[PDB]
């Protein structure tokens, strides 16, 4: 229900939480043929079968991806300039597919 | 205090040290091995990458 959902929100309307109570795996975003790009920088690429978190995502949405080279950290373009500002204190990892 | 003698004015390049090894070393042993350290996944037949 989280990754195969129907319709997206606005880009600025997200959930201020992190995932909870789960067998974190990192496996599907690498091995599934639907996924192409997944770059984790500050965290090891296989490090969720021991890592662990507190609050809880329910990010259940899918959106058109025709803005590939602008939906990325530290970028400018037609999307993350107004109506949604990327923070100075972003901490996390990005999937692209 | 010895900044002046074992230091070339154009650079002393003849002193080496090991920065990569699969295992921590033993007290007062001598390792002369020059095998290429394995960091990633695929091996080399004498190439880079």
């Amino acid at each position, epitope marked *: 229900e989280v990754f195969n959902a129907t319709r997206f929100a606005s880009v600025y309307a997200w959930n201020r939480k992190r995932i909870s109570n789960c067998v974190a795996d990192y496996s599907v975003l690498y091995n599934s043929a639907s996924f*192409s*790009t997944f*770059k984790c920088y500050g965290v090891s690429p296989t490090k969720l079968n021991d890592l662990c978190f507190t609050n809880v995502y329910a990010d259940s949405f899918v959106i058109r991806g025709d803005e*590939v*080279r*602008q939906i*990325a950290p*530290g*970028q*400018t*373009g*037609k999307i993350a300039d107004y109506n949604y500002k990327l923070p100075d204190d972003f901490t996390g990892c990005v999937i*692209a597919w | 205090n010895s900044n002046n003698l074992d230091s070339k004015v*154009g*650079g002393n*390049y*003849n002193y*080496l040290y090991r*920065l*990569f090894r699969k295992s921590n070393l033993k007290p007062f042993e001598r390792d002369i091995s*020059t095998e*290429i350290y394995q*960091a*990633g996944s*695929t091996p080399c037949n*004498g*190439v*880079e*990458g």
Partner: antibody, heavy 126, light 109 residues
Framework: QVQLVQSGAEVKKAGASVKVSCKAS????????INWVRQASGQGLEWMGW????????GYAQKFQGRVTMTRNTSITTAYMELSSLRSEDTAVYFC????????????????????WGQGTTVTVP | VLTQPPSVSGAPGQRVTISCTGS?????????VHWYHQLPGTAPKFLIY???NRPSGVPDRFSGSKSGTSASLAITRLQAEDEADYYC???????????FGGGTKLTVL
């Protein structure tokens, strides 16, 4: 703190060989992965050889295989890419390369040639 | 080798993008792709390494990403002050260490 000097404009003949040097001295060479990329007149750049400046780890180009010899002088901090068996179609403009990536890390990152060597051409005309 | 739009024209304005297309073994591991800035009259000091990270010499106009089987870039307006040939340097792993591409020249009108 990067200094990079190649040879000058020359002229050679087919069947000969050039023992070309690509000279630098005066910083920590061990931290960098020295590449070797050439170019052509009006055509793109293509890479030939690579250098780990410690103990001379060796790798050759497939396009210029059997006619290439790679050697270095770590005593004077010098690397060679000896272009052996010069040809008739050798008429082009070649370059060295160098890395500036800090290769004390395990990852095979791209070499940061934020300086590139000067100028060279192994032209062979009659 | 790797296909890309080789010659362009531009004046200042709003963003324009580039790609550099490789195969699956080339585009899969070749995320170290970057573009040799060969400006007229200087050494090929590339001004872009490892996509989005830079040495000194360019503003934040240029973007770095990977696009399926294509190694992609996004300018904020390919324009009249940026005369420079580019290439694409993908770390090809099982193939040669890095094989270059079509050679998109960022150029002027």
């Amino acid at each position: 703190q990067v200094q990079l000097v190649q040879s000058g404009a020359e002229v050679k003949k087919a069947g000969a060989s050039v023992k070309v040097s690509c000279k630098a001295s005066g910083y920590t060479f061990t931290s960098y992965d020295i590449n070797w990329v050439r170019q052509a007149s009006g055509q793109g750049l293509e890479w030939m050889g690579w250098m780990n400046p410690i103990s001379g780890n060796t790798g050759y180009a497939q396009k210029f295989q059997g006619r290439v010899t790679m050697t270095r002088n770590t005593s004077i901090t010098t690397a060679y890419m000896e272009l052996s068996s010069l040809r008739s179609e050798d008429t082009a403009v070649y370059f060295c390369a160098r890395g500036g990536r800090y290769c004390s890390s395990t990852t095979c990152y791209s070499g940061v040639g934020m300086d590139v060597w000067g100028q060279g051409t192994t032209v062979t005309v009659p | 080798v790797l296909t890309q739009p080789p010659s362009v024209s531009g004046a200042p304005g709003q963003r324009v993008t580039i790609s550099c297309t490789g195969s699956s073994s080339n585009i899969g591991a070749g995320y170290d792709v970057h573009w040799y800035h060969q400006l007229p009259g200087t050494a090929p000091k590339f001004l872009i390494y490892g996509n989005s990270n830079r040495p000194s010499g360019v503003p934040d106009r240029f973007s770095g990403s990977k696009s399926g089987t294509s190694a992609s870039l996004a300018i904020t307006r390919l324009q009249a002050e940026d005369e420079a040939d580019y290439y694409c340097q993908s770390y090809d792993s099982s193939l040669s260490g890095w094989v270059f591409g079509g050679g998109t020249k960022l150029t002027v009108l």
